[PDB]
Amino acid sequence: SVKTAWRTQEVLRELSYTQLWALVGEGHVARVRFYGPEKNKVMATTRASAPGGERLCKVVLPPDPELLDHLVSNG
Amino acid sequence: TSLDGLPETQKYVYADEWGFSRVGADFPPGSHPSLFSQLLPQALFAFDARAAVAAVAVPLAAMAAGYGWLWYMHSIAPVWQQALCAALIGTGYAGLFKVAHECAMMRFIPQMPGLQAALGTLLMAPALYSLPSWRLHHLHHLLHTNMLWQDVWGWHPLTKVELADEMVRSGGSGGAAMAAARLVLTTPIKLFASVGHWLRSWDGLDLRHFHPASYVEVLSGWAAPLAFAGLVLPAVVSAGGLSGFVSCYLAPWLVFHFWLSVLSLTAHTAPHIPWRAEGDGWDAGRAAVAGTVTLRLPRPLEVLLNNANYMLPQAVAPGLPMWSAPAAYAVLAARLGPYLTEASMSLKLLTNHVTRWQIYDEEAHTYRPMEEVVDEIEADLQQLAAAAQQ
Amino acid sequence: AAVDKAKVLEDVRSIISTQLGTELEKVAPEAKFVDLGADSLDTVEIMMALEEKFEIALEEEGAEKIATVQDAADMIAAQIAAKGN
Amino acid sequence: WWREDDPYWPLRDWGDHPMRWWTLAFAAIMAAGGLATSVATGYVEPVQAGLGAGALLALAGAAMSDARCVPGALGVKLAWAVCALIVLKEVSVGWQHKRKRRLAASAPRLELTGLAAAALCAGYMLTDMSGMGEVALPPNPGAVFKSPDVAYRASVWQKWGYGQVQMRV
Amino acid sequence: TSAPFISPMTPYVPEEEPTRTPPSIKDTGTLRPASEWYPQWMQYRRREDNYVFWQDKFMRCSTDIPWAEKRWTLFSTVWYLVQQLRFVGTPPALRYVAFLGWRALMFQVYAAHKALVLWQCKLDAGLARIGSGGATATFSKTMALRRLHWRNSPLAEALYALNLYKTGRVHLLPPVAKPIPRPTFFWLF
Numbered sequence: 001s002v003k004t005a006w007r008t009q010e011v012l013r014e015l016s017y018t019q020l021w022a023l024v025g026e027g028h029v030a031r032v033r034f035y036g037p038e039k040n041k042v043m044a045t046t047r048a049s050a051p052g053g054e055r056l057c058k059v060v061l062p063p064d065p066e067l068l069d070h071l072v073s074n075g
Numbered sequence: 076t077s078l079d080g081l082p083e084t085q086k087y088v089y090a091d092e093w094g095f096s097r098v099g100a101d102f103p104p105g106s107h108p109s110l111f112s113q114l115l116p117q118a119l120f121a122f123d124a125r126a127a128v129a130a131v132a133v134p135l136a137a138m139a140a141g142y143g144w145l146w147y148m149h150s151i152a153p154v155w156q157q158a159l160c161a162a163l164i165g166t167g168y169a170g171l172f173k174v175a176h177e178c179a180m181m182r183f184i185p186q187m188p189g190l191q192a193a194l195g196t197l198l199m200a201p202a203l204y205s206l207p208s209w210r211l212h213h214l215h216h217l218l219h220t221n222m223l224w225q226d227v228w229g230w231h232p233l234t235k236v237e238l239a240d241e242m243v244r245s246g247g248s249g250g251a252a253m254a255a256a257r258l259v260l261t262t263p264i265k266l267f268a269s270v271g272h273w274l275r276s277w278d279g280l281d282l283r284h285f286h287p288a289s290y291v292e293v294l295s296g297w298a299a300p301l302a303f304a305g306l307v308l309p310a311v312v313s314a315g316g317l318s319g320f321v322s323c324y325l326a327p328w329l330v331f332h333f334w335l336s337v338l339s340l341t342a343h344t345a346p347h348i349p350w351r352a353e354g355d356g357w358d359a360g361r362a363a364v365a366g367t368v369t370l371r372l373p374r375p376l377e378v379l380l381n382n383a384n385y386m387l388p389q390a391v392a393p394g395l396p397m398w399s400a401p402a403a404y405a406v407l408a409a410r411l412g413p414y415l416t417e418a419s420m421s422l423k424l425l426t427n428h429v430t431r432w433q434i435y436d437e438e439a440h441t442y443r444p445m446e447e448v449v450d451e452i453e454a455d456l457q458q459l460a461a462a463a464q465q
Numbered sequence: 466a467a468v469d470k471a472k473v474l475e476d477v478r479s480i481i482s483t484q485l486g487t488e489l490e491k492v493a494p495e496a497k498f499v500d501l502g503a504d505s506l507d508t509v510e511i512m513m514a515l516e517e518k519f520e521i522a523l524e525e526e527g528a529e530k531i532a533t534v535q536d537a538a539d540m541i542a543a544q545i546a547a548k549g550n
Numbered sequence: 551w552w553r554e555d556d557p558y559w560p561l562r563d564w565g566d567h568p569m570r571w572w573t574l575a576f577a578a579i580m581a582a583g584g585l586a587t588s589v590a591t592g593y594v595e596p597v598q599a600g601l602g603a604g605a606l607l608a609l610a611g612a613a614m615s616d617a618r619c620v621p622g623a624l625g626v627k628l629a630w631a632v633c634a635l636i637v638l639k640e641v642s643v644g645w646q647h648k649r650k651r652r653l654a655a656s657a658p659r660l661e662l663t664g665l666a667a668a669a670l671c672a673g674y675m676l677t678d679m680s681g682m683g684e685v686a687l688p689p690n691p692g693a694v695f696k697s698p699d700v701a702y703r704a705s706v707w708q709k710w711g712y713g714q715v716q717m718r719v
Numbered sequence: 720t721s722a723p724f725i726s727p728m729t730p731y732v733p734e735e736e737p738t739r740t741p742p743s744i745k746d747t748g749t750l751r752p753a754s755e756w757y758p759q760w761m762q763y764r765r766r767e768d769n770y771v772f773w774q775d776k777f778m779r780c781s782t783d784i785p786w787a788e789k790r791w792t793l794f795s796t797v798w799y800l801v802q803q804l805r806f807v808g809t810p811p812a813l814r815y816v817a818f819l820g821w822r823a824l825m826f827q828v829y830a831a832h833k834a835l836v837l838w839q840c841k842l843d844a845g846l847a848r849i850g851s852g853g854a855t856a857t858f859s860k861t862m863a864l865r866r867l868h869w870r871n872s873p874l875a876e877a878l879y880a881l882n883l884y885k886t887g888r889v890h891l892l893p894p895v896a897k898p899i900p901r902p903t904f905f906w907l908f
């Protein structure tokens with residue numbers, strides 16, 4: 001839990017590939033930046049309304065042509 | 076002693092009137108307690124591992140039983156079950172604390188001194204007490220037993236004269252110190268006044284009271300309580316919240332302090348035991364033999380407390396180990412018989428301690444209730460005001 | 466350790482004259498300060514001007530009892546003399 | 551308070567460190583506030599940090615009651631270390647129970663605990679923290695180049711790895 | 720007393736090594752700057768007595784350094800870089816211009832501080848009147864000079880103000896402030 005630990009040195013969380021999907025579906029991801037020498041890593045910044053507040057998460061992207069429409073559809 | 080030469084009839088009516096069994100006669104002056112160490116058989120001083128491990132293991136088992144139960148039924152149990160587990164844990168810890176008091180006076184395991192020092196430190200820490208400071212205060216108590224104005228590490232009584240002085244300074248009986256004394260020595264909270272003792276240790280956290288050559292040893296002594304209260308009292312709270320604190324630590328703590336306070340208070344206070352000043356008839360042997368009261372408990376309680384009530388024997392033979400204290404007493408009761416005082420722990424005794432013997436007046440050299448005494452000295456205040464007419 | 470008390474005296478008197486506004490003939494080595502027009506708050510500013518000109522620090526205990534020009538000169542000279550040690 | 555007979559009693563050499571009651575006061579404040587906060591919310595870091603710092607600062611303020619000894623100096627060093635660590639955690643990592651929903655609303659900033667700890671550190675430095683001055687990094691071959699001692703210079707060169715160099719001195 | 724053998728009537732306070740070099744000989748106690756090269760008092764002394772100038776330079780620069788200004792710690796190996804920049808990486812001409820500017824600034828600051836000290840003298844001379852309730856209106860010149868040379872701690876000032884406000888008694892002065900020793904921690908600083 002968050003209630004039983006010391007706050008330590010803000011870093012990037014890690015989503016696998018799937019809670020990213022559910023999160024961007026529920027309208028919670030707020031901005032996405034692509035990076036990686038082969039352009040398959042994502043740094044996603046959520047919005048305040050999400051469970052946990054604004055955080056900075058990291059996702060690894062394995063080729064999926066449905067991604068762009070999903071993202072741009074949900075603002 | 077207060078009741079000097081007089082037949083057995085008045086002695087025994089006083090005895091059953093105050094709840095004591097055998098009152099005491101009168102001891103000659105000019106002696107010392109260390110004399111009667113020659114009346115003891117030499118076999119009483121022998122070391123054996125059996126009683127040692129038994130004394131360190133029985134209270135540990137009682138504590139573990141109480142804790143296993145209490146956690147098995149953490150907060151779903153009603154208040155009486157909580158009270159009973161707290162009483163059991165407090166008594167077990169009073170037993171382990173008696174063991175630690177033995178290691179402080181260097182008479183538990185003398186062959187391994189480092190081990191007995193470490194053991195005493197460990198067992199004293201959970202009560203937030205220091206081992207070197209405890210040794211010092213207890214030695215100072217043994218040297219000044221029942222000395223008026225000097226035995227500050229025991230149940231020094233509230234005398235009439237200082238009360239009158241405070242009432243003359245307060246301009247009435249409504250001040251802050253007044254009401255403080257009023258509730259502390261008139262209500263059953265007196266049976267916990269040992270907590271005051273706890274706060275007077277840590278002599279201001281002031282290294283300027285001690286001999287310099289001992290600083291490092293005293294500092295270390297203070298760091299074992301603190302470390303506990305700095306590493307373990309967090310965990311408890313963090314793992315159980317306020318309730319999980321008040322039931323796992325605070326209630327056994329209050330029970331342990333009940334035991335400490337009642338033991339000492341009954342030990343050295345009674346209407347027939349005077350408190351002579353220094354130079355005015357204070358005698359060492361007379362105060363350590365005649366001015367002591369032995370409390371008798373059920374044998375289960377005794378074996379749980381490691382014979383913590385037997386205090387007279389280890390004041391005449393300070394090296395006498397803990398498991399030889401009952402037997403040794405039986406010896407002394409044969410030879411010092413007519414002078415000793417004894418009592419059994421009953422409700423009447425504690426009711427008398429709370430309601431009757433509250434203020435010590437030295438002219439009559441006895442204890443009298445607080446309220447009648449204060450109204451009497453206030454009527455004499457009115458009469459000296461009338462005497463202050465001109 | 467050896468101070469030209471004459472030079473110190475001339476410079477003290479010149480500083481005093483320039484501070485108060487009176488002319489150098491009126492400032493005599495035994496003239497007190499109260500008659501030259503000096504009032505407490507200015508027997509201090511004179512001390513500050515003296516220190517500022519000579520670049521020294523005055524001993525305060527003795528500086529409480531300065532009332533004539535010769536005491537000023539002797540204080541300053543005893544300060545300048547005890548400089549190395 | 552006021553003492554008409556001698557008003558300047560606080561500036562009198564009583565035998566302890568000047569910053570000795572402030573240290574115990576701050577320890578008490580830290581402990582009380584930590585326990586109160588961790589009970590009022592449910593977080594377990596406030597009480598742990600508060601009571602740890604309280605224990606360490608009470609021990610340091612006990613040792614600081616005789617400033618001439620060696621423990622009298624190690625006490626000051628311990629107190630300074632603890633207050634510096636508190637200031638650091640406050641201004642660089644912040645506290646767990648002070649997270650918000652936003653990102654700039656929950657940034658580590660200096661509040662009132664960090665400020666008190668910084669004031670304490672300045673007070674230790676500007677009163678007396680000069681003891682145990684012989685603990686430093688060991689001397690170089692650069693410090694003993696001009697020293698008048700051949701045995702000492704040889705010893706230092708040996709320790710630093712130059713035992714075979716020729717001492718044309 | 721602790722002393723088993725010998726104990727004078729005033730207890731012995733164990734004095735330790737000094738931790739900082741003394742103020743030079745050229746400086747004053749105040750804020751106003753020194754004198755570029757030669758002091759002014761040098762002109763009122765025997766030529767064979769002014770050798771203390773160069774002796775003081777030798778003492779502060781080479782021969783009396785307290786072994787606490789030579790500790791190697793982690794803070795000092797970075798201050799080394801700051802100082803080496805100032806001394807070897809900056810041309811002396813820009814340093815000279817900055818020197819002139821800093822001198823002018825310090826003169827302005829000293830003038831301000833002197834004004835403030837005189838103001839304080841009136842204020843406390845006024846406070847002693849409330850204190851005594853009656854006549855007393857003077858002040859203490861000793862305290863004025865001690866304020867100008869930074870010889871009072873803030874606590875001493877506050878206690879003096881209180882003593883004035885309550886009992887007049889303008890001539891009862893706090894003892895004096897002692898110099899601050901160099902702070903050391905460990906290998907750290």
Ligand SMILES: CC(C)CCC[C@@H](C)[C@H]1CC[C@H]2[C@@H]3CC=C4C[C@@H](OC(=O)CCC(=O)O)CC[C@]4(C)[C@H]3CC[C@]12C
Binds near residue numbers: 275279304
């Ligand atoms: C906070 C809980 C969960 C853990 C246990 C904390 C104890 C280790 C603390 C709290 C109460 C403290 C005591 C409270 C009162 C005092 C008196 C105080 O000194 C004085 O008041 C000196 C005399 C004076 O000020 O006039 C500092 C030491 C002492 C024994 C303190 C020592 C440390 C104690 C026992």
